[PDB]
Structures are given as C-alpha cells and as structure tokens.
C-alpha cells in the first residue's frame, strides 16, 4: 500500500494530494500533527521534522522525503508515467527551471507573513510576485497554466501557495497576492475548478488560521482570532455607522483603535485610502467605505430588525433615496465645520429639506425614525452626523440651528441619541465641542 | 397604460443605464420624451425638481436618480436583485465599484469641456488606468467586473463607454481605453449584448449630444460632427487628401494648422505631429496622406474611381506606381532639403521606375497614369511634380528632371491644368517664395 | 490567369505570399532561386530589384509583378472573397493599411540585432519596435488574438513570417526573447502558427537559425558551433564541470564557449541574465540553464551512453533525486565554508555529506564505488566536481580537517570517479584547483 503521512494544514502536502487526484493513485492517509503536537515517533521516521512523507511497500516499508520527490514519484508510477513533468525534454527543462524558483517566491510570502506591516517584506514580495508572472508570460501563449491548456508540476507546486496567500494575506497585510501577478491570478482561477484542487482545499478561514502561527503576536488583527475586524477610530461619525449597524444587528467584530492625523504608516496598506473604518472578513476580504460596511453587516448578520428591507423594491427605493441625500447633507455638515464656505451651508440645508420631506410622508409609518419605530440603514447613515450638528450648532455658528428649521429631522436625532445602541457607541456632546475647539 | 412609465432622453447615458436593466429584466414601461437644458419644459421640472432625466413613473410616486431607478427595476423582475450580486461579498464588490463610476465620468467630461488640455488629459489616464486596476482587483477571466456575470457595476459605466469612444477621438483625439485594456473587452462583450445594443445611440449621436460640452473655440467644432482634415495650405501631402476630395466631391470641413512649428495642441490630435489627419462622422482617425487619399476612395460616391476595383491586374498597377511614388518623395524632399547625390540619384531612379510604367499605358489613352483622368497613383505623385516644377531649373543649379522624362512632364502638366489642381495648388510663384523662405531659416544657425 | 512563383524557402518575405495564397485557396507553379552570391543573372534579368519573390502571371502574355505586399494583394484579390484578407470596411482597411505601413521598421529593428547580436543599443531599440507593435496591436484589438480580433488578415500575413523565424534565431544569436516586450505579438504568433497556410509553409527550428546566419557577425560566439548545440562554459567552474561530464558521459556534442569570469564580459548578461555559466543553447534556438537541468536535458536527448536518470523505475528515479537534492546542500555548504568561512557552513557540509553517506550504503543501485554503482549517473555527476573541489581544499585549507576521513563511501565516489576518462577529459589537476583556491582568496585581498 501507499501510506502518506500529512497535515491538512500543510501546503507541501497539498502539493501531494493534488497529484495522487490527479494520477488515479490511491494511499493511506496518516495525520501527523505540526510543531508543538509532532510526536517523537514521527520524528523517528522523518529526522527532518517536516510532512509530508511517503510511505512505500508493506512488508519491507521504505520512505520517500520531501513534496516534490514525492509528487514525482506519483507521477511516475500512474499513467502515463510522468506526464506531469512534461512532454518533450524543452517543456520538461521549463518546468524544471520554474520549480527551481517556488521556493522564492514562498519565501517572499511567508517573509510578509512574519512581518505584514514592513514596507520592505511589502516589496519583496511586489517585486517577486512580478518575477513569477514574468516567468509564466515567457513560456505561455494562451494560459492559464504555465503550459497554457496542459496543467503540470509548475501548477502544482505553486497553487496550495496561491490558496491560502489569497485570504490569508489580504486578513494579515491588506495585500493582495495578485496585485503584480495577473497571470498568476488566472493560473490560480484555472487550477481552483479542478476536482484535484476544490476537493483538497481547506476553507479561507482555515487558511488565516493555518498561517496564525507565522504572524507576529502584536500585529493588530491578531485579538480578532480569526473573527471579523473593523479598523475605527472612537471620534469618527462615519465609523460610528458601522459600530452603529453593529449593536443593532448583534455583530461582533474586533475593534482596532487607529489614531488619526497621525495615522500610523502601516494603516494605508490596510486601506489605500487611508480612512476608517474598515472592515476585513474572517474569509479574509476586506469591506470599505461606512454605508458599504452598513449594508454588509446587514446582509450578514442574523439577529436583529434588518436595516435595508429586503423583498420590497419600492422600500428598498426609500432607503436608497434617503441614504443617498444623508450623503449630501455630510458633505455639506463637514465641509461647512472645517473650511466654512457659504456653498456649505446652502448644500447643508438643501440636503436637509430632501430628508426632512421624505421624513414628512412616513414610508415605514408612524414614529421619529425614517424607520418609524426602528432604526434603519437610512437612520444610521444619518445619525452620527445629526449628533455633530447639535455638538456644532449653535455654539460655533454665531446662532445658527439647523434643528430649528428642520423639526422631523430633529425628532430622529433626539430619539437616535437616546437609544441603548447610540450610547454605547458616541462620545459626549461636550467631548464633541472639545474636538470642534482643537481642530480649530 | 403600463405600471412604469420612463421620462427620458434619448441623448442621455443615464437614461441608457435604465434602459439596459428594463431590457435585461424583460421589464416593459412607457417612454415618455423630454427635451434638455433650453427644452426642457416646466411641467418636467415640476415632476422633478433636480432637472435632470431620468425620472421613473409607478402607478402614483416618482423615483429620481438612475442607479435608484435602476435598482427599483433589478428588484421588481425575477430573480429580484440579480443585478446587485449573489452573495454579500459580490454584492459588495459591486457597490464600492460603483462608488468609484462618479469620477470616472468626471474625468471624462473635465476633458470633453477643455479637450487639449494636458492636465484633464492626465487625469483622464489616471482614471482609466484606475478603473481598469478596479476590474484586475475583481477579475478572473473577465470580459465583464464579475467575469462571466454581466452586473450593475457594468451597467452603470458601459453607457459612458460607448458615448466616449467616439467623442474622446473625434473632440480630443483621445482614445478612451489607451490606458484601460480590461475596461475596452467589458466594453466590446457588452456591445453584443441585446439590451445595449437596441438602445445605443449610433457614433455620430455620439458625438452629437456632447457637443454641448466643448468648447466653442475647439478646432474641430465648424465641421458640425462631419468629416475633418487637419492641413496645410502649403504641405504636398495635404495636397494628395485635397485633390482626392476634389476629384471625389468628398465634402470635408479644413483646419489649417500652422507649421514650424506646429502648435503644442497638433500633437494630440496626431502623435506624429504631421499634416494631413482626417477625422470622420464616426469618429474614426485616418492618418497619413496616401492612407487618407484611399479612405476617401473607398467611402465616396461621386466622380470616377481612383482605384481600379474589382480587377485584380489593375489594382497591382497602382500599387506599384504609388509605391514607386513614394520613392520618387523620399529623393525629392531629401534632395530639395539637404542637396546630395545619394538624393539626386534615388529621385532619377523613382523618376525612371515611374516613367518606365507609363510608358506601358496600363490604363489607355491619355496624359494620366489612369489615362484620361487622374487615379489614385496621379493623386500620388502630381503634388510633387509641382514642388519639382517650382524647384526646377531656378535652385537646382541648372539640373531639370523633366528634361529627361517626357511621360513624365506630361502627367505633370495635364495634371496642372486640371479644375481640381487649380483649386488646391498655390502658384508656382507662391511655392517659389517657399522655398526661398525654407533655405533662409536653414543659414539660420 | 496561370501563375508562377519565383522564391526562395528561406525567405520570410515569400513565405507571405505563399500563406496568402493558402489562405485564398490560389494555386502556382513554384519556382526556386538561389540567394546572394547563388542568384543567377536570368532572375536578375526579370527583376532587376534582384530580390524574391517575384510573380509571372499568364503563359501567353507573360507580365510581372514585384514586391511581397503587391504579390500579397494581387493573389487577395483574385481569390473569392476578393480583397477580404484587406478588410471588410473601409475603416477596418484603413486600420489594417497603417499597420502594414510600420511593419518595415520592425523587421529593420530586428534584422539590425541580428546584425549586431550583442550590441546594448540595438537591443533597445528591438525592445522599444517590439512595445510600439504590441500597443498598435492594443489600440486595435479588443479580445486578439490577430490584429483584427478573430479575423486573420493581412496585418497578421505581414509580420507572421518573421515572427517565426526571429523567436529561435534572436534567442540562438542574441539571447533575446522576440516577445519579452511584445505578448500580444507572441498570442498573434502562436495562433498563426496553428493556422493550416502557415504551419505548412513554415521552416523547421533550425532553419530558422541557418537561413539567417548570413547577417551574424563571424566573431559572435556561438557561430563556430554552426548551429549545433553551445555551452557557454569556463574552465574552472565545477557548475559547468557537471554539464561537461554529462556530455562526454553521453557523447553529447556541444560548442563550448570559454566565458572569462571576474570579471565576465558585458555582453554574458544577455545570454544569461543570471551573469553564470554553464548556459546551453539548443539547435532549435531554446536555452537550457542551470547545471544540473543542463545535466537532465542533456540525458534526456542523448542516444548513446549509459542513461543518467534511470527512466522507467519509480522508486529508482527517486533515489536519484532524493541524493541530487542532498548533493545541492552539499554544494551550498562546501561553497559557502571554502568561500567565506564559518562553522555553520562546515556544520551544512557535515550534514549533507552524512545524507549522501547513508544514501549509498544502501546501495541502491547495487555493487560498486559510484552512486550508480558500476558506473556514474545523475548524482554522481551532480556531486563530483565539489568532491574534487573538497580535495583540493583539505586538509590544505582546512586546518587539518578531512571531511573524507569521515565518509569512506563518499570518498570512494570520488576516487573512482577522478579515475574515468570522462573526469580526465573535464577536470584541472587538483594543484590547479589548488591555485585557484589561492588565487580567490587574494582577490578577497
Ligand atoms: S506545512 C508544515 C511544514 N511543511 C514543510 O515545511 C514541508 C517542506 C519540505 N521541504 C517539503 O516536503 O517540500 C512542516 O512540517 N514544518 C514543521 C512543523 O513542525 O510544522
Ligand atoms: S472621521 C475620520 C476620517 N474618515 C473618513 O473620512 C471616512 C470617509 C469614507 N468616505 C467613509 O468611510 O465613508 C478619516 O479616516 N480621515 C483620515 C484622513 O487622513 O483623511
Ligand atoms: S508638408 C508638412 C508635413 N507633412 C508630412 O510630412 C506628412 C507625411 C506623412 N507620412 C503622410 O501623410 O504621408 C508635416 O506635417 N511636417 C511637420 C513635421 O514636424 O514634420
Ligand atoms: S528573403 C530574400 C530577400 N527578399 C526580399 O528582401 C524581398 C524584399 C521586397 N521589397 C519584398 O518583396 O518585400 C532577397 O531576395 N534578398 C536578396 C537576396 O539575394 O537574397
Ligand atoms: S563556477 C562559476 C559560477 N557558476 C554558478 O554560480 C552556477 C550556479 C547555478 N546554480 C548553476 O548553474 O548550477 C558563476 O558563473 N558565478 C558568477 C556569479 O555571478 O555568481
Ligand atoms: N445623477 C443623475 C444624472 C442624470 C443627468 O445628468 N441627466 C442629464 C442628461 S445627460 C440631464 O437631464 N441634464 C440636464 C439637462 O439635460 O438639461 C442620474 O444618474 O440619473
């Protein structure tokens, strides 16, 4: 029989169960546990210390090391013996030489995964992404694999990497593994549909998780254990919405203080744009942008009255509409606190009388909330900023109120402001005013 | 009456926008037309007080803002919401895609209103190399944002593509996906697809409903959307697509474009920085003198053939001599330029080539290569013929090329007696004084 | 009418108009001429240009047409459809009569590399002619993989003649990929080449690389090989010692091409970007690199000599690679403790030496001195050079310490394997090796 002794955490072992699918060749599966829980009897058979191993011959049992001689020797014993390696001698000499670089490029990732928030270990792997995709650009025509339509050893070695660098990179570095490796992304997309590859991959969140034991202790999703994070900032109104959707629909989620003006330098590879808050998935994507991360904690989440009303289009149009005017009211509020324009303040009150009117024909009935009784996503959209108009106005204003001219919109800052929910997440009206009074 | 009514226009991308989803829905309303900007009329402007179509119309309530409206319709037609994603991480791979359409279109008409500018024109590189990094982020194998998957995040930006292919070229010489590869094979695979299809304008609406944007002053903008050939009163290249038009009354609308130098705008318009460029309806680039000549031949519908289609014979003769033509430009201008008996020599041999051809009468009786009139190899050469009239015997130091080819000469001189050639030829007193011009500027230092 | 074609088969220029006529479904009598100094006066009595191809068209009125492109064309328009491979508007003709307007400044480029193979300048210039083909190719494309999409047409005819030719001939004479900047270039080539016109008319690898040896500079460095297989060697590397055992081991013919090291020449880096020997060019124009892939192809192509992979056995061709992996940490720990010193490098070295010890007891490949046991294979080979190398290095350079006074099995590798005639045909003397070693480390300092 054939005995193969593995972890379903291992990439290399991957490697070995995806040429075993691929050849038709069958064996014994052995779990042999990693680091701390590898037991002293396997070390006895591997002094290396490393799986996976093969196992060959009942009676007189002999063992093969190390995933690639070990995927060639599956190779060569299923029909047609070999063919992974190649056809002709060139095309076998390509996929030699592309193997001889793996090993690179996996140090390259498992370098960044030791230190995620390096610039240096970010480039590194930049720069030998893009060497990869050089290689496979100078031996394809077509793709998607390294031998176009013909999936090899070059594919194998590579793809268990892919896999689990996809989400595993993106939850611990924001990267994107194919940022500089289009064709290498395509190789993957191909290599992700074979029943070789779909049926011996472990879930994204196994991946993260496989990889825990690289990332350092103090890198700040690591609280998260796995779980859904949101990168926030306890002054901010727009994260404010999404810890906002997050009490009212039961969502937990790791909260990462990120201080601003200062930012720190590694917050922009979480996110490009430089901005809280954003959210990251414990299958390893990340969700931007305050509304879009209320939407998606909505779609989500189990508990709860839901924030966008689902099955109904017309309320689902109300929703979108008043979410969509809270926007240009923010625009106006903030832009209004910092540079003070008169184009500020019309657009403010513009906004306003487009939410104060569509307020005025309660499309979700009776109560002070665009919701009615409940908050909905409207109401979160809306809120944060309602509470930076009272902390606002009329002390640094010269008199001016907004909620003196706009009652229904007034009636749902009131009424948010007094909710469980809402205490929980701001911050005193007076802690406001003191922030208004050090950013000018 | 329908549940749905659609206050349109039909010049308007947003609009275009609602149309695609109706159609991928198989969701019917009634079009209601409505005029823009100085037509619009109050009664649309009391329906919606923004101003701007499209407006949707149920039972009754308005819905304002096409991807609101467009929403409505992807959530009212089985299978409801399809359009927005399958999952939540579709959906919200979709959402902050479209979340990022709004400065793309920005982009796009900053540049429509100042076309030559260089700053706009950056900006639209950088926002199209943006989007299409947008696309490698969520793309496997494409041709669409989700793949195989046609989504909102395509609908939403498709009608802006089909709009500023034409348009960016024809007011800016701008190709709209010379930065954005992914974005022109979403473009080309939505193209096919019936709901954008049946509801795009053709090119020359295109450029039509934006013309509102350009500027006034824009060189282009005297054409009225029709054909435009950059020139030169003085350039013998120029004079080929000018007598091709004459000889084909191929209606064109003139720019002059000063040379040396040319003005830093010229360079955006043709990247080689050279006289004639012709831009069509369609808003198409044709580039290059004898090029240009042929397109002319192929599109016209009047006056005799240049080129000698549907024989196969006749068509190398052409070739050849247009060809051999073009040797006898090369010696010309380098010999006119530079003097040289390298020069001196390559012009006897074209000279020769194509004297040696009409000596063979391929196309009958006559003083013409084409015999009794002008074809595309006359077009060709006549330009040159001139320059060579104007530089020979006075600045050649005595040496007179017609002398030695008589067929030759007389190609030349029918050819400058023809009603065609009087009217786009300067005098050869006038070419005179341009050579004298040219070899002051060149003692320069 | 009846049609003869005068060309040669080394001649991309007439392979145009043979893919053309395939394509057309037109027939003709062929007619071979010789090139150069083999032209005979009766063919340059009939083209006085004294260039193939050239077309004869009718037996009673014999009438001839010049020039690939016009023979192209002619053969295009009388095949039905007539014209089509030109276009089927007149926009996309147009697009297609511009492209073939710059095809000739790409030949030039690369015919001006092939003249000059390792030149820094005309390398650039073939990177910058191959990006400008491929963004024509961009702004005319929306999915490829031909220039006009799905349709081949005469752009493609154009340029698929040298594209085939140039991918083995620049890597054979330049060590230059033809698409390293192009791979719009490359997809146009590779679905081309599956086209029946051209993968019939097309010329074997190796001709590829004979048909152009005309314009290659005598004293480039693989010209001696004539056109056979190149090593790219020097005298003292046991990296290229391993390649050169495997070729006398399998008589394996190779042109070696002594490289001086530190410094290498300027012009190394563009037959191996990696600046090491051994490096392998193939008659087809392939490079081979690293020594041990070299060792592996060299065994799988070779016909004579005892097999250096045991091929056919799976557990056997494991043993090989289970000792030439042990045998590359071997080489890192022998390289980098005789290089730079240090005890982690000795400890490496321990280590490897002991894998490779306890591989041989077992005696896979049964009785003998050798890895392969009565003889050497793969692994043998791979280890060799470095045990000489480890020779040379102790006890002399050691301090006393013998790693072969702890390894009897190794030790007997080694010797049996400095006693073949293939190692007394490879190797320095070990007091050569031994100089070597000195002179290293002075260079040091
Ligand atoms: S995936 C866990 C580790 N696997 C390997 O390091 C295998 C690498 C070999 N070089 C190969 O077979 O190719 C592992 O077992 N590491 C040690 C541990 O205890 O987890
Ligand atoms: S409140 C702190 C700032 N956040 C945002 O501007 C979020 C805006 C987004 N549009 C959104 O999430 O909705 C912030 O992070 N400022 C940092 C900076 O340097 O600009
Ligand atoms: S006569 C003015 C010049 N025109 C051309 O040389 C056109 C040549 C093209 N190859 C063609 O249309 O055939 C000109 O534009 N000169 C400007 C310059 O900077 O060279
Ligand atoms: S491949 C051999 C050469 N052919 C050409 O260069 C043809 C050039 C023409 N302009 C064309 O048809 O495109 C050739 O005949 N060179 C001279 C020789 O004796 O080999
Ligand atoms: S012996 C000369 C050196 N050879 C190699 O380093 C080859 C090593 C490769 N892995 C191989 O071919 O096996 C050499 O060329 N050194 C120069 C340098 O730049 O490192
Ligand atoms: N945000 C709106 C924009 C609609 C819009 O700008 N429509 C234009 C037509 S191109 C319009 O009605 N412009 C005003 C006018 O034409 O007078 C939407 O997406 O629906």
Same mark, same amino acid.
């Given at each position: ?63 093969? *090391? ?31 030489? *592309? ?23 970010? &480039? ?102 796995? %779980? ?39 917050? &922009? ?75 500020? &303040? ?20 009776? %109560? ?27 002390? *640094? ?25 809402? &205490? ?17």
């Amino acid at each position: 029989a054939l005995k193969l002794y593995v972890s379903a955490t291992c990439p290399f072992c991957h490697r070995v169960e995806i040429v075993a699918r691929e050849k038709q060749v069958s064996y014994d599966r052995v779990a042999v546990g990693l680091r701390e829980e590898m037991p002293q009897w396997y070390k006895q058979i591997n002094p290396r210390e490393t799986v996976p191993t093969l196992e060959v011959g009942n009676a007189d049992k002999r063992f093969m *090391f190390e995933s690639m001689l070990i995927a060639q020797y599956l190779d060569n014993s299923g029909a047609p013996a070999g063919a992974l390696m190649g056809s002709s001698a060139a095309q076998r000499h390509q996929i030699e030489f *592309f193997l001889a670089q793996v090993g690179d490029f996996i140090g390259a990732a498992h370098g960044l995964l030791r230190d995620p928030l390096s610039g240096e270990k970010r &480039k590194a792997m930049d720069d030998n992404a893009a060497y990869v995709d050089g290689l496979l650009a100078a031996n394809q025509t077509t793709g998607p694999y390294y031998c176009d339509g013909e999936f090899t050893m070059a594919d194998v070695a590579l793809v268990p990497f892919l896999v689990r660098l996809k989400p595993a990179l993106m939850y611990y570095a924001g990267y994107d593994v194919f940022c500089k490796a289009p064709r290498m992304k395509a190789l993957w997309a191909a290599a992700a549909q074979r029943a070789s590859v779909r049926e011996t991959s472990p879930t994204a969140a196994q991946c993260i998780e496989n990889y825990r034991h690289l990332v350092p202790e103090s890198a700040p999703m690591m609280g998260a254990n796995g %779980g859904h994070v949101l990168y926030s900032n306890l002054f901010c109104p727009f994260v404010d919405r999404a810890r906002l959707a997050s009490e009212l629909r039961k969502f937990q989620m790791h909260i990462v203080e990120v201080p601003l003006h200062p930012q720190p330098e590694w917050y &922009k590879y979480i996110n490009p744009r430089d901005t809280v808050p954003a959210l990251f998935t414990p299958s390893g994507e990340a969700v931007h942008e305050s509304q879009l991360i209320v939407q998606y904690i909505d779609c989500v989440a189990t508990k709860g009255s839901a924030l966008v009303p689902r099955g109904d289009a017309e309320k689902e149009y109300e929703v979108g509409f008043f979410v969509e005017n809270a926007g240009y009211f923010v625009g106006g509020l903030m832009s209004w606190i910092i540079r003070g324009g008169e184009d500020a &303040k019309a657009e403010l009150q513009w906004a306003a009388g487009e939410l104060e009117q569509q307020l005025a024909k309660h499309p979700f009935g009776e %109560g002070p909330f665009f919701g009615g009784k409940r908050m909905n996503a409207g109401d979160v959209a809306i809120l944060p900023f309602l509470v930076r108009a009272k902390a606002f106005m009329p002390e *640094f204003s010269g008199g001016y109120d907004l909620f003196a001219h706009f009652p229904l919109l007034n009636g749902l800052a009131e009424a948010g402001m007094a909710t469980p929910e809402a &205490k929980s997440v701001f911050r005193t009206l007076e802690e406001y005013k003191e922030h208004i009074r050090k950013r000018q």
